[PDB]
Design a protein around this ligand. Structure first.
Ligand code: EMC
Ligand SMILES: [Ca+2]
Ligand SMILES: [Hg+2]
Ligand SMILES: [Hg+2]
Ligand SMILES: [Hg+2]
Ligand SMILES: [Hg+2]
Ligand SMILES: [Hg+2]
Ligand SMILES: [Hg+2]
Ligand SMILES: [Hg+2]
Length: 487
C-alpha cells in the first residue's frame, strides 16, 4: 500500500474528501478520467449545504472550505466569476393551453444569502485545497480493473503501473468502475449554460405585481408544470459578480411526457407549450452544448459516496446536502480505520444508514412533488411539507455548528451527528415532522393510484399541517394565502 486512500472523481466531493484526509495525515490519491477545468451541474446551494461546509471546515480545521459556503467569500477568495447570489428558492407554476398567472408563485426567502456555484471554478478551487494539503491528483486516466483483498486495494491503470491503497472512495457520478466491477419516478434531464437570459422580473412580471419579498432573478427559479420542470439559475445576478451565464436545465416525468428529439428541438417545443417560460429566452444563446442525461454502499475496503449509489433528483438540491454530510460522517471513520489498521465493513455502517435514508427521503420527496405539479393550489400546500422539514434540519445543523464552535470537541460532534434519530431525513431529529412527512406521502400516494380530485387532497395535506403545526417552527406554514413564508 503506497497510499492510504484512493479517491475516484476530482469534483467538489472528491476534492473535499481528499483535503480533509490529507490534512489529517493520510496519503491520498485522487483519480479522475477528465481534467480541470470542466463543466458540472449541481449549482444551487442550500442552508443545509452551507452549514455542512462550515462543519467540515471547523471539524478538520481547513478555513478555506468555509469560504465555499458564503457568497461574499467565494467572490473574494475563489473569484468574481465563481458564483451568483441566491436569496431563496422560488417555484412558478404553469399550465398547457392557459395563460400563466404571476399569482401562481411561491418563494420562501432565506435569512442569509447562499451561492449559485459556477462549478468549473468552485471545483478547481476545492481540488487546489486538496493539493495544498498534500493530496496527489492524476487527471486523464482510465481505470481498467480494481482488485480488493484483506490487505488492501489495487487499481490497474491504462498505460501506467498499478496503484495500491488501504481504502478506495467513489466520489464520482454513478457508473464508475467501482460501481460496475463490484457485484419510483422515471425521469430524464437536459441542461446547459446560456448568454442573455432575461430575468423573471424583466421577462414575466415585475416585483410590484408578484409582491415577492425577493427578486426571482436572485433566487433558484423552478418553473413547474404537470409533466416536469425547468430551472433558471443565474450567475450574473449580483454587482460584484463578473459571470455572464445563466444555468438552464429542464427535466421530464417520462410517465407524462417522453422526449423524442434532440435537446435544442425539445427546448423549443417546451417554450411553445409554456410561452411564459419562453419570455426568458428571446435574445438568449447557448454558451455550450446541451447535455442529455437519461435515467451496496460500503464494504471492508471500499465506500461509494451518495452520488455513486444512484441518481439524486436535483428538484430541491439535496445532492450537495447528502454528498457533504456523507463525507462528514465517513472521514472520521476512515481516519480511525487508518490509525488503528482495522478495515471492516461494520466500522462504516452508519455511513450506509445515512445514505439509504437520504436517497429514499429524496426519492419520496420528489416522487410526491411530481404529483403536486398537477395544480398550483396543491403545489402551494405541498411545498410547506418540504419547507418545514428543511427548516427543522437546517436549525439542527446550525445547533451542531454552534456547539462545535463553543466547545471545540471533535469527538463530541461526531457522536452527536451519529446519535440523531432520523439520519438522512429532512428534519434529522424530529419524530413529529417525520410522522407528518410519511402521512403526507400516504395522502399523495393514494391520491394518484386511486385518482382523487386535487381540491380534496390539497385539503387533506392542509389539515395534516394544522394537526402538526405546534411541533414545526413558528413560521405559519398553515397560512395558505401567504405564498412567501418569512423566517
Ligand atoms: C424516507 C423518508 Hg425519512
Ligand atoms: Ca500512510
Ligand atoms: Hg456570489
Ligand atoms: Hg427520456
Ligand atoms: Hg443569465
Ligand atoms: Hg459509503
Ligand atoms: Hg445510498
Ligand atoms: Hg412523499
Ligand atoms: Hg412513502
Amino acid at each position: 500500500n503506497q497510499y492510504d486512500v484512493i479517491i475516484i472523481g476530482s469534483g467538489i466531493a472528491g476534492a473535499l474528501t481528499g483535503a480533509v484526509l490529507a490534512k489529517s495525515g493520510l496519503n491520498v490519491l485522487i483519480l479522475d478520467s477528465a481534467q480541470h477545468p470542466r463543466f458540472s451541474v449541481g449549482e444551487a446551494a442550500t442552508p443545509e449545504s452551507g452549514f455542512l461546509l462550515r462543519l467540515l471546515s471547523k471539524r478538520f480545521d481547513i478555513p478555506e472550505i468555509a469560504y465555499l459556503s458564503h457568497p461574499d467569500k467565494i467572490i473574494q477568495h475563489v473569484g468574481s466569476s465563481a458564483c451568483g447570489i441566491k436569496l431563496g428558492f422560488s417555484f412558478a407554476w404553469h399550465q398547457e393551453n392557459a395563460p400563466s398567472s404571476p399569482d401562481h408563485l411561491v418563494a420562501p426567502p432565506l435569512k442569509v444569502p447562499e451561492a449559485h456555484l459556477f462549478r468549473q471554478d468552485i471545483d478547481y478551487f476545492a481540488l487546489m485545497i486538496a493539493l495544498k494539503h498534500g493530496a496527489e491528483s492524476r487527471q486523464n486516466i482510465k481505470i481498467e480493473s480494481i482488485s480488493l483483498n484483506d490487505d488492501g486495494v489495487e487499481v490497474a491503470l491504462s498505460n501506467a503501473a498499478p496503484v495500491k491503497a488501504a481504502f478506495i472512495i467513489d466520489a464520482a457520478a454513478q457508473g464508475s468502475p467501482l460501481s460496475r466491477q463490484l457485484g419510483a419516478t422515471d425521469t430524464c434531464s437536459f441542461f446547459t449554460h446560456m448568454l442573455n437570459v432575461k430575468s423573471y422580473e424583466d421577462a414575466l412580471a415585475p416585483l410590484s405585481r408578484t409582491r415577492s419579498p425577493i427578486e426571482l432573478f436572485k433566487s433558484t427559479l423552478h418553473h413547474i408544470f404537470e409533466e416536469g420542470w425547468l430551472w433558471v439559475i443565474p450567475f450574473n445576478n449580483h454587482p460584484q459578480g463578473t459571470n455572464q451565464l445563466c444555468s438552464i436545465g429542464f427535466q421530464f416525468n417520462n410517465a407524462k411526457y417522453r422526449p423524442t428529439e434532440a435537446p435544442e428541438i425539445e427546448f423549443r417545443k417546451l417554450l411553445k407549450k409554456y410561452p411564459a417560460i419562453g419570455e426568458h429566452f428571446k435574445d438568449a444563446v447557448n454558451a455550450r452544448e446541451w447535455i442529455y442525461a437519461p435515467r451496496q454502499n460500503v464494504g471492508d475496503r471500499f465506500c461509494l459516496l451518495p452520488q455513486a449509489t444512484g441518481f439524486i433528483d436535483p428538484l430541491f438540491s439535496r445532492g450537495l446536502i447528502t454528498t457533504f454530510e456523507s463525507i462528514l460522517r465517513l472521514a472520521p471513520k476512515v481516519l480511525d480505520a487508518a490509525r488503528s489498521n482495522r478495515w471492516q465493513r461494520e466500522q462504516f455502517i452508519e455511513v450506509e444508514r445515512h445514505c439509504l435514508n437520504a436517497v429514499a427521503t429524496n426519492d419520496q420527496l420528489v416522487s410526491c412533488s411530481y404529483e403536486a405539479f398537477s395544480d398550483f393550489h396543491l403545489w402551494n400546500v405541498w411545498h410547506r411539507v418540504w419547507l418545514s422539514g428543511s427548516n427543522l434540519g437546517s436549525a439542527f445543523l446550525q445547533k451542531l455548528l454552534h456547539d462545535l464552535e463553543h466547545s471545540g470537541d471533535a469527538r463530541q460532534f461526531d457522536a452527536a451527528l451519529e446519535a440523531v434519530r432520523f439520519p438522512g431525513c429532512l428534519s434529522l431529529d424530529s419524530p413529529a415532522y417525520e410522522s407528518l412527512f410519511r402521512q403526507s406521502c400516504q395522502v399523495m400516494q393514494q391520491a394518484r393510484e386511486q385518482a382523487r380530485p386535487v381540491a380534496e387532497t390539497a385539503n387533506a395535506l392542509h389539515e395534516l399541517i394544522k394537526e402538526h403545526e405546534a411541533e414545526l417552527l413558528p413560521l405559519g406554514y398553515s397560512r395558505i394565502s401567504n405564498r412567501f413564508i418569512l423566517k
